[PDB]
Design a protein around this nucleic acid. Sequence first.
RNA 1: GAGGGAAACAGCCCAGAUCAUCAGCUAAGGCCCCUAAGUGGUGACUCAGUGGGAAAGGAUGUGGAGUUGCGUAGACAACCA
RNA 2: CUCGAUGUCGGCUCGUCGCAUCCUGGGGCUGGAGUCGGUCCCAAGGGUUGGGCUGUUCGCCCAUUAAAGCGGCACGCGAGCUGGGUUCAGAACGUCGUGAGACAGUUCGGUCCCUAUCCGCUGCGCGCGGAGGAAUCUUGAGAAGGGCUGUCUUUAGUACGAG
RNA 3: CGCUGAAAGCAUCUAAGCGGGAAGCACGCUUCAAGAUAAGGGUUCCCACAGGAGUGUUCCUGGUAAGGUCCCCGAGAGAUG
Lengths: 23, 177, 214, 37, 146
Amino acid sequence: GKTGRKRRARRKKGANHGKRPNA
Amino acid sequence: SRIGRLPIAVPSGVEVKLDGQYVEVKGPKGTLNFTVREPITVSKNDEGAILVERPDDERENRSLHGLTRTLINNMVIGVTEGYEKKLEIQGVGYRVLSKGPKQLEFNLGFSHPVIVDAPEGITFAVENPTKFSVQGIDKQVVGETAANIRKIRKPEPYKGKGVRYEGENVRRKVGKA
Amino acid sequence: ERTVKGVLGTKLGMTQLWDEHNRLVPVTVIQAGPCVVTQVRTPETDGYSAVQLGYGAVKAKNVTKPEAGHFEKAGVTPRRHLVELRTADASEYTLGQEIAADVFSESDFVDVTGTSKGKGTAGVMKRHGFGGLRATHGVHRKHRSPGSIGGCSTPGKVIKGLRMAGRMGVERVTVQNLQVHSVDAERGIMLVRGAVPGPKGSLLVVRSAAKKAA
Amino acid sequence: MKVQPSVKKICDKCKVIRRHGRVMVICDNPRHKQRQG
Amino acid sequence: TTYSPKAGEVQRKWYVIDAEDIVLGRLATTAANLLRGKHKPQYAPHIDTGDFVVVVNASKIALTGKKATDSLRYDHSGRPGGLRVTSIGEMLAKNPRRAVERAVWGMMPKNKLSRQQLKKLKVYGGPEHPHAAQNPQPYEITQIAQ
RNA sequence: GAGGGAAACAGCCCAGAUCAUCAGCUAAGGCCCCUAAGUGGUGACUCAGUGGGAAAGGAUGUGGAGUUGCGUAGACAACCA
RNA sequence: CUCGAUGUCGGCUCGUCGCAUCCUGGGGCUGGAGUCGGUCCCAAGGGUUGGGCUGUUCGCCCAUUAAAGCGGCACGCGAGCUGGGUUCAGAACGUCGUGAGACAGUUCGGUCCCUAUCCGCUGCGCGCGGAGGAAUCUUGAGAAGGGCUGUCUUUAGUACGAG
RNA sequence: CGCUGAAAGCAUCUAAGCGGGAAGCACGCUUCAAGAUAAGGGUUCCCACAGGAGUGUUCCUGGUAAGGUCCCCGAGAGAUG
Ligand SMILES: CON(C)Cc1ccc(O)c2c1C[C@H]1C[C@H]3[C@H](N(C)C)C(O)=C(C(N)=O)C(=O)[C@@]3(O)C(O)=C1C2=O
Ligand SMILES: [Mg+2]
Ligand SMILES: [Mg+2]
Ligand SMILES: [Mg+2]
Ligand SMILES: [Mg+2]
Ligand SMILES: [Mg+2]
Ligand SMILES: [Mg+2]
Ligand SMILES: [Mg+2]
Ligand SMILES: [Mg+2]
Ligand SMILES: [Mg+2]
Ligand SMILES: [Mg+2]
Ligand SMILES: [Mg+2]
Ligand SMILES: [Mg+2]
Ligand SMILES: [Mg+2]
Ligand SMILES: [Mg+2]
Ligand SMILES: [Mg+2]
Ligand SMILES: [Mg+2]
Ligand SMILES: [Mg+2]
Ligand SMILES: [Mg+2]
Ligand SMILES: [Mg+2]
Ligand SMILES: [Mg+2]
Ligand SMILES: [Mg+2]
Ligand SMILES: [Mg+2]
Ligand SMILES: [Mg+2]
Ligand SMILES: [Mg+2]
Ligand SMILES: [Mg+2]
Ligand SMILES: [Mg+2]
Ligand SMILES: [Mg+2]
Ligand SMILES: [Mg+2]
Ligand SMILES: [Mg+2]
Ligand SMILES: [Mg+2]
Ligand SMILES: [Mg+2]
Ligand SMILES: [Mg+2]
Ligand SMILES: [Mg+2]
Ligand SMILES: [Mg+2]
C-alpha cells in the first residue's frame, strides 16, 4: 500500500539514522 | 562536426552580411535571414567563403556547428539556385490545375475541388494534369508545402492513388486477392 | 468586441399570428419605445465601448437632482430606466441620439433579456426537478425530500454547489435566436416570435442575436 | 505502432533513436515501429 | 533590555527592482527580505519595519530548465472539480503580478503581519510603474563574499 | 523521559530537566526564504525537477577507465562500374 | 481502533470522483477490396433506456438504443426513505439429540425514535467598512452553468470491387 | 502525421527551429461577481454648518444640504427581512 510504503520510506530521512518506530 | 568543419563557398553575386549573431543573405532570387545559436560563431575566411567554429568539442557545440553549417549552406545554395520539388498524382479522376503561380486547385476524388494558396516565397508550376512542382528560395518552406500537398491525399498501399513525391517509393499490397 | 444593435422595451403580453405558411406562431408584444443615448462609454475615458440608453416615462417629482443633472448633460428629458449596450460601434452613437424599434427589421434574429418571474422559496422538486420519494409503500414523511445530500465519514461534508431548496426566479435570463416577426415604429411596437422572460410590464433588452441565427 | 517497455531491432533496417526523451524504433516496414511506454 | 521598535519609529523606504532576466527564486527571496526588513539592524518580527518593493519588468523574469512550461501553479475554488492549473510561463505572460506575489507569499512567514506586508509589494509586468511620487530607489540584487 | 533533530509523528537520532540568567561553547541535525546560521571556497558529475518512492527487463542519455580489431599498403560513411 | 453501542443486504433519492473508455471525438498498425471489423495509442466534455424472474447483489431473458462501461466514496448515502433479506421472542417441516433443545436447512409472522447546538451546505437579511456625504450606470480579478446524439436526403450507386 | 537538420560526411519529426493535429485544456455562449478590505471606473448632485472642550487642528456634541428611511396604498415581489 501507498501509506505503508511511505511509512517505511520515512526512515530514510537524515535525522533518523535508517530506523524509525514501526519500521 | 565533420560537416561543420568543412567551409562554405560563397558564389558570385551573393551578399553575405555577418552582423554578429544575425546574418543576412542577399542573392538574385531573394533575401534570407538567420540567427546562429550563441555558442557558435561565423567568419568570412578571406571574404571568399564562410566558416563556422564550435568553441568547445562538447555535444551541443558540435551539433549546432553541423546544423548551422548545413543551414547556412542551404540558404546560400537557395539564393543562388533555388529549391525545386516535383509532385505527381496517380489514380483516375484526380487532377490539378493552376489559377496562377501561387494558386492550385485539386480534384482528388473529393466531394468538391480543394483550393491551395501559396506563401509569398512559394510559387507553383504545373505542366501536366497529373504532374506539377513547387519552387522557392527556402528549403524548409518548400519541403513543408510539398508535405502539406501530399497530406491532402497521401498515396495508398492498394492503387497508389494520391499526391506522391517524384522519387517516392510508395508501398503497396493486395486486399481482395 | 462584437458589434451589437439594441433597444429597450416593455413586455406587454402575448398573442398569436399566422405566418405565410399558415402556421400559428406565438408572438410576444414588446413596446420597444423610444430610447435616448444618455451616455457613451469610450476606451479613453471609461475603458470599454458601450452605449447607455434611457427609455421610460418618469414623473418630474420622482427624478432626483443627480439624475436630473445627468440627463441635463445628456441634453434629453429624464427617463425612468437606464441600461447599457456593450457594442463595439458605440462611437457611431451621439449623445442624445434617438433610437426606435425600427432599428430591427422584419426577420432579424434577436436575443431578449429580462428578469424572470419570481417564485419565492421553492422546494427541490420544483426548482431543480428532483424526483422525490413514492407516495406509498411506507414512505415516512419524506414524499418531497431531497434524499441524501452527501456520502459518509468521507468526505464528512456536503460538497459545495449541491442543489437544495431556495428562492427561485427574479434573475437575469436571456432567450436567444427569437425571430422578430414585425416592427411598427410609428407606435413603437415589436412582435417577436416566442416567449420572453418576465411578467407583463417588465423591462426587456432586445439585442441582435449573438449567434446570428440557428 | 507497438507500445512496449521492451523495444528491440527486429529487422536489419530498423534504427533505434531517442526522440523527445523516449526510445523509439523506426523502420521502412511499418510493422516494426515501436515506442517505449 | 533589548531594543524594540515603536510603531512608526522605523522609517519605511521605497525600492524598485528591475526583474529583467532575474531568476524568480532570487527575486522572490530578495523581495521577501526587503518587505520584512531583515536587512535593517532595527528588525523586529512583531512590528513592520520593512520597505516597499516595486517590481518592474515582471513579464521578463528568467526561468531555468523547462520551468516555463512544466512548473505548474494550482488554484482550487473549494468545490468538486474546482481545480485550475496554469504553467508559470503562461502566468508570467498573462498576470505576472499574481506569479510574483505567489512566490513572495510562499517565501514569507504565514502571519497576519505577513499578509499586511505583502501588500507593500507592487508588481508590474512592464518596464514602467506609476509610483514616481513615492520616488523608489533602484535596488541591485548582490551577494556578499564568503 | 521533559529538551534538540526527524514537516507533524510514545518506541528512531542527539541528549537525561535542582531553580534563576535578555552570557558563552557544542551534539544530532543544519546554514536561498519560510527558519537561527554560507544565495560559502575549490574540483568533478546530473539537466531527469533526477534530487524529492519501486522490480524483472529494456535503451546509440552522458562523463570516466580499460582491453582489442581495422586505418594515409589507406579505415568507416557518403558517390560512380 | 470502537463492546458506559462505529446499526450490517438490495432498492429509492441525491450526487461526486478515478479511468483500467460502453457510445460519441482523434490517430497508428493491421492478418485494413469496399463495407466492416481488431488490435492498442490519445481522450473522462457530455451521454450511458424501459421491462419479465428473484428480498436479492449477481445472473438470465424480452424490446430497444449512438451506447446500455468498470470502479471509489463506512461493499457513498436508514438523526434522508424503504424493511423484502438478515439476526429476537410464536409456529411448522426435514435432519440431529434420551431430553431440554440445535441447524450459513426450509417455511409463515414479526415495533425503525430524535423540535439541528457546532461544522457543512442551499437561500435571504442586518451591520460596519470601502478617508466627505450621496444618486445612477458600470469594468471583471475570480466563480458557476452549458458541452449528448440519432435517422433520412444529397454528394453517389461516385471511390473501391470479378460480381 | 510532418518540414528543415546535425551530433554520426549518410540518415533521423529534434538535438536549434517551424507546421499540422480531438467532443479533452483555455476561450467563444449564459449567469454571479469590487467583503477583488487590492473594497475598482465613468457620469451627476450637495456643499467650507453651529456650539464646546481643545493642545497642529485633534475629538465629542447639535441643526442641516444632496439623498434616504420610517409610516401608508399595493404587486410584476415576498416565510420574515
Ligand atoms: C431481527 O433482528 N433484529 C435486528 C432485532 C430486532 C428487530 C426488530 C425488533 O422489533 C426487535 C429486535 C431485537 C429484540 C431485542 C429484545 C431483547 N430481549 C428479547 C432480550 C432486549 O434486550 C430488549 C431490551 N428491552 O433491551 C428488546 O427490546 C427486545 O425485547 C426486543 O423487543 C427486540 C425488538 O423489538
Ligand atoms: Mg498492493
Ligand atoms: Mg412522484
Ligand atoms: Mg404520508
Ligand atoms: Mg470533518
Ligand atoms: Mg527512561
Ligand atoms: Mg522525548
Ligand atoms: Mg520532536
Ligand atoms: Mg517539532
Ligand atoms: Mg558556535
Ligand atoms: Mg555536526
Ligand atoms: Mg513554523
Ligand atoms: Mg554561487
Ligand atoms: Mg553553493
Ligand atoms: Mg520521468
Ligand atoms: Mg520524482
Ligand atoms: Mg527504477
Ligand atoms: Mg460514548
Ligand atoms: Mg487513458
Ligand atoms: Mg461519466
Ligand atoms: Mg477534467
Ligand atoms: Mg443470481
Ligand atoms: Mg459510480
Ligand atoms: Mg454500504
Ligand atoms: Mg446517515
Ligand atoms: Mg421481515
Ligand atoms: Mg434488520
Ligand atoms: Mg404433511
Ligand atoms: Mg428422535
Ligand atoms: Mg421471515
Ligand atoms: Mg429535520
Ligand atoms: Mg472572469
Ligand atoms: Mg474570493
Ligand atoms: Mg528523414
Ligand atoms: Mg521523416
